[PDB]
Amino acid sequence: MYEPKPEHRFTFGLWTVGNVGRDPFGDAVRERLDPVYVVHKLAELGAYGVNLHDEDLIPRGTPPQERDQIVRRFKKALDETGLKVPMVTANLFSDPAFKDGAFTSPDPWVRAYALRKSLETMDLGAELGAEIYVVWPGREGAEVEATGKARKVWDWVREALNFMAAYAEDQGYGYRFALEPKPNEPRGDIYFATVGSMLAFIHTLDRPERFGLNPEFAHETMAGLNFVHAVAQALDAGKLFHIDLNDQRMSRFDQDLRFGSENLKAAFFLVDLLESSGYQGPRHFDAHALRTEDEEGVWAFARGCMRTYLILKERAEAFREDPEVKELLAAYYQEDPAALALLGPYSREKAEALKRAELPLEAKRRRGYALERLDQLAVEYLLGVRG
Template sequence: MATGFFNGLNKVTFEGADSTNPLAFRHYDADAVIMGKRMEDHLRFAVAWWHSFAWEGGDPFGSQTFERPWHPQDNMANARLKADVAFEMFDLLDVPYFCWHDLDLRPDQGNFADNLATLNEITDYIADKMASAKAGCLWGTANMFSHRRWMSGASTNPDPDVFAFAAATVKSNMDATHKLGGQNYVLWGGREGYETLLNTDLRQEMDHMGRFLNMVVDYKHKIGFKGTILVEPKPQEPSKHQYDFDAATCIGFLRKYGLEREVKLNLEQGHAILAGHSFEHELAVAASEGMLGSIDMNRNDYQSGWDTDQFPNNVPEVALAYYHVLNAGGFDTGGTNFDAKLRRQSLDPQDLIAAHVGGMDICARGLKAAAAMIEDGGLSDVLRDRYAGWDNPEAQAMLGSDLGAITQRVLDLGINPAPQSGRQEMLENYVNRFV
């Protein structure tokens, strides 16, 4: 039975670049073929359950502004209604996937046994809806940062009982993700960090987090979960210093604890900005190590000091992001989710649809631009020419040599190199031809 929440709104369709319909796709054509693959299969869009349906419109300085039929979110009847509305929106947008935290789906019950029961109940309900729907589960994860029990961390908590509660919580969410056919399982350590070193044993906390993640990988294989385990870097929100600061930090962590062949990264544009990076930097770092798994393509407000999770609207940023995704071979089990977090003044159902339409369209424009740059080959030509000197056998031989022999070669040949222009301005102008 229809909920009526989206009454008056029609299924979103592709109308082309000349369309003035604010609730139509101008660039996202699911069946358009880009570099030999359908656009839908490149982008693999997933609606994020949390900001789309669970967020109530608060911010650090103000309380709830949204009034939804499933409020308050403290009972299972409203959780089921929220799921009904979610699947209606998935159908309106014709998206292939969704993603979730457990706390998005059902209210926290205050104890593990009841949390487990309600999680099983709501995911059974969702599984029934999936049987007649297009949208599948891209990934699930556990919210281990909102409840006060997590205030000092989950796997890094000084209290072993909290570690145990976290382990049980992750197991139950992995089981739920597996049940829903999820293609990935994500761990984001929102409280895996510290506020002050005065009461923190860094080495012990990092070792516990490494052991915890190894347990997750072991359990994945035990239950036959074929998806990818992903960790999501984030620098300093909410903890003052988080152990999963950025892609490079996470890669170092994974290598230290022997997980580099088992775990990849779920990278978010907004988190990259908080870490002082560009999104393409984080993607390039992950891709260089073979650890690029999935992406969260939202954005920050550059005038705010926190993660505002707005839907993407910057084509040049998105194009450069997908340039690195495509160069890395595209997504395997991963995809593109974006929070499409509404502003607190955007109260209506059509605002929620418009946010997703806009975000999906910007991603489509960025993907097309990225593919065009790859097919043109201008950037790859520049890289090949800039590093061409290393194709010389003598240059390669240096890498297997030693400092003394290299010094003698400089003296014998009178090597005195002249700097060569990096031509950054020309390259930036080149990118702007496509976006």
């Protein structure tokens, strides 16, 4: 009963299953796949949509007559299969021009190029029916602070993003922009390192309401931060516009592992959080197969992402309805009305009452929260030892 359905909204980028297995110390181990071919494969596999960079579909320097031929051949396949393209993004990292930043390059010709490349990807996405536009600032960072550029980048990236959002307004595009933070790699440090950094940033834009987040499991986990907490903050802010799902061992290079493969328990509580929050956006698997795999292994990878998500979704439902879990949580969240009356909106009469209330301090200093028992129960559900 773990078969992917379109209402699950699983998506894959062309670059994900299409990854040829090249790394900084190794040749490609797989053959480049045709975009129309991976659209048919994903459809066969049960995916809802495919995402793309501009350069995933249209190589740099393609004459704008060959470009339109590529786009129409690609749209035919989407028509045939019923796959959606929910999300696009410009590649602002491969081109050598972007060696010291795209939006944060000190050279205004390069910031102009980055902006242009972005407008063009917006136009492409509009053709394909994309509704989300992701910005990953892979190149926006530093390893040499002596420049003093950290003081300049906030205004530069504000300027780009305001221009992009006004352009969409002007064109009648219905894009929501989803910003994707990452702490490092390829840059020594990337300026917009965390979900919080991007959240803070959005509040400074002209049209904040068009902007939200694309958190990736692996990005937060690289820095050893807690992804569930970061996503809960994004949700609390009403800014979870997209989410990238994969796995990652902490404190190293981005591994882009199959979802749920390393950090089961964290995966478990992420799915629980998304599902019980009424998140309605794509579940994107921004990951790729292990370099030890041939093409059959690529489709095993893809199947396993979705399958693991669905096993965890079901398990999370069963966990939440366990009677002992409900009993532990009800005691956990026990709320005295007498206590509640001292809290809430400021009074002065509350401030005065609070300062002279008889607080049951000794009882609270001795309270055990029974979290060791609750955690063991969660582990036993995960292990399938409990029903």
